[PDB]
Each structure stands twice: as C-alpha cells, then as structure tokens.
Write a protein that binds this ligand. Sequence first.
Ligand SMILES: *[B@]([O])([C]N1[C]=C(C2=[C][C]=[C]C(C([O])=O)=[C]2)N=N1)OP([O])([O])=O
Length: 358
Amino acid sequence: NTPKDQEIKKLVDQNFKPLLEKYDVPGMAVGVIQNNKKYEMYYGLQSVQDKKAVNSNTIFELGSVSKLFTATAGGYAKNKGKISFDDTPGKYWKELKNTPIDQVNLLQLATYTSGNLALQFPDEVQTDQQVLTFFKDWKPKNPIGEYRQYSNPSIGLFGKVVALSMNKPFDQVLEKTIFPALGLKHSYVNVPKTQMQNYAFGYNQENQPIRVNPGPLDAPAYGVKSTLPDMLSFIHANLNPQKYPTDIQRAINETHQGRYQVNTMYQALGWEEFSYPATLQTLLDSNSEQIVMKPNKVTAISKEPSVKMYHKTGSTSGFGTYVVFIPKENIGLVMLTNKRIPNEERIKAAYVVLNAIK
Ligand SMILES: *[B@]([O])([C]N1[C]=C(C2=[C][C]=[C]C(C([O])=O)=[C]2)N=N1)OP([O])([O])=O
C-alpha cells in the first residue's frame, strides 16, 4: 500500500544513493519515466564551495550523451531531404571535395567506421582552420566501413556537415531547431550568462572543481548541457515519437535503427541497441575497454530482434551521464553526476532499478 513515487524513490535510494559515499560524488540527479509519469530524485550539491543543492534547475554536462542530439539532428536533416547518409562530407564542406576523407559516407562518420579516426583529435587541433587542415591531410588505414573505433572527430565531422546542410552553425541547429522541436527549455550548447548560477561545477578525481574545456568540434561530440527535467523529456520523446510532429518524429525513429553489430551490441545513430530482455553482462560488455578504446571489426545484423532497449554513457572531466529506455515496458532512466563514477556502476544501478519497478 505504498504510492509509486515512494517505491521508485526507495529503489533509487537503495541503488544510486550509496554510490555518492563510495566514489565521493558531490551531487547526483536520477530521473525515471514510466507510462508518461516522471519521477525526479536529487542528492547533494551542484557546488560544494557555494553550498548550492542539486535541484530541477541544475545544469549538468552530458558529455557523449551529446552524440544522441547530434544523431537526432542528422535524422532531422535526412528526413527533410537536406542530406543522404550515402553522401560524403565534400558535398557540403566543399574544401574536402576530392580528399581521401571524401571517400567516407555520413553514416560511416556517424557510426565511427572511417577506419582511421581515434577517440580524440591531436591536442594541437583547436581552431576551425586546424580542423579543416586535419581532415584535408587525413588518409585511410583500415578498409572503410569495416572497423568501429569510437571517435569524437568522426561524429564531430558528421555534426559539422549536418549543420552546413541546414545553413546554420551546429549550436543554432540544436538551440533554434532540435531542442525546441523536442520541447527542451533548459538545454544548451553554450550556457548563457543568465543561467551560469544553475551550471554545476564538475569535480575531478581529487574533487577539485572543473568544467569542460573548449575543443575542436566539441559541441556535436560532447558539448551539450541539460537539466534532469529536460533529459526526462528527451527520454519521453524517444519512448513516444508518434506524439511529436512528423519531422522530429522521423528524426527520433532514424536514431533507433541498428546499422551493424559488434557481438551483442547493435550500433544505432548515437544510441547503442540490445535485444530486450538484455542480461546485465551484455550491457556491461558494451562499455568494456575493448569496445570503447580499440578498433573492432563490425558484422552485418543477422538477427534483428522484435523488442529492443537502448542506452548511452557520457563522461567529461567533471561529469558522468547515463540514459537508458525500454519501449516495450514504456520506461526509461537518466543519471547525472558532477563527478565521473565507473560506467559499470551506472549501468548496474539502472539495471536493478528498472528491473525491480512494478
Ligand atoms: B564520451 O563522453 C566520449 N568522451 C569521454 C571523454 C573524457 C572522459 C574522461 C575524462 C576526460 C577528460 O579528462 O577530459 C574526457 N571525452 N570524450 O563517451 P564515453 O566515454 O563512452 O562515456
């Protein structure tokens, strides 16, 4: 005879709250959506030195969960006929016409299969001129389309091309088109002066306050900041795309389509996809050092499951993110922290909570 809000709170207290003491995490926001009912749980401090509590207004760095907004933007551009995933970047970024990188298509950039792009740009690459020079000087290594290497430059270039195709800088594509289409009110590429009071400090592994550094093509790769209420609205859109206008509806569905497999992990656009029900170990394997940090030969999808679940981890120097949703159970979860904790702890906490809820 316990209300649903209190049962979810108890499960999140049991599974997420102990991670704050264990990893010395100053602040955490955990959100659950089930049957279009949203539950918001806030713990600890957005700023230790200011003694400001995490709340519904607190802005967190999403890190690589930013890639889900880049993927959604690409899906929007494709379904409006602004790009094809069979196009090469040279069609939109003319200075890349007839260069080796112009042999790589947009889908291969978005899904990390160029065959010669690492996690990060070289440290020296900062300016737009330096980014252009990097891609002009790029040469293939592995056969194009065959090897997955998780890469910021790779989806970064996809983002930049999607932006060129819509005649707007990438920050404006998200802030003026995609965020408003998804009904997000407190989501930013650039947090304005009037919201800096709501922008959490991140905390590094010595619990020193830090925020993300500017970097080359940072926005499309890891540059989005958001609140728990906005991230629950984003999960709602992914659970119920039919309720949104055609353009963003088709954009969202585009991001759910598996493109290839690496064992039990299906690479969608931004999202990782699994046959549901998934075992905990399947979800843990998706974020192993081998999958995240090294190249892996991809396979064609040979078993398309009827029922799928989707997740994505995100990290910056000072922030950890995890988002997961299961269409069949009409349920999802968001975790935001202002200190990185191991990916495996995020995945396991979410797994226990989502499997225990009635
Ligand atoms: B994204 O967030 C890709 N990603 C992670 C990072 C990162 C992680 C930890 C520290 C630092 C640093 O100190 O700046 C950066 N940069 N890009 O995805 P994952 O790692 O898969 O969740």
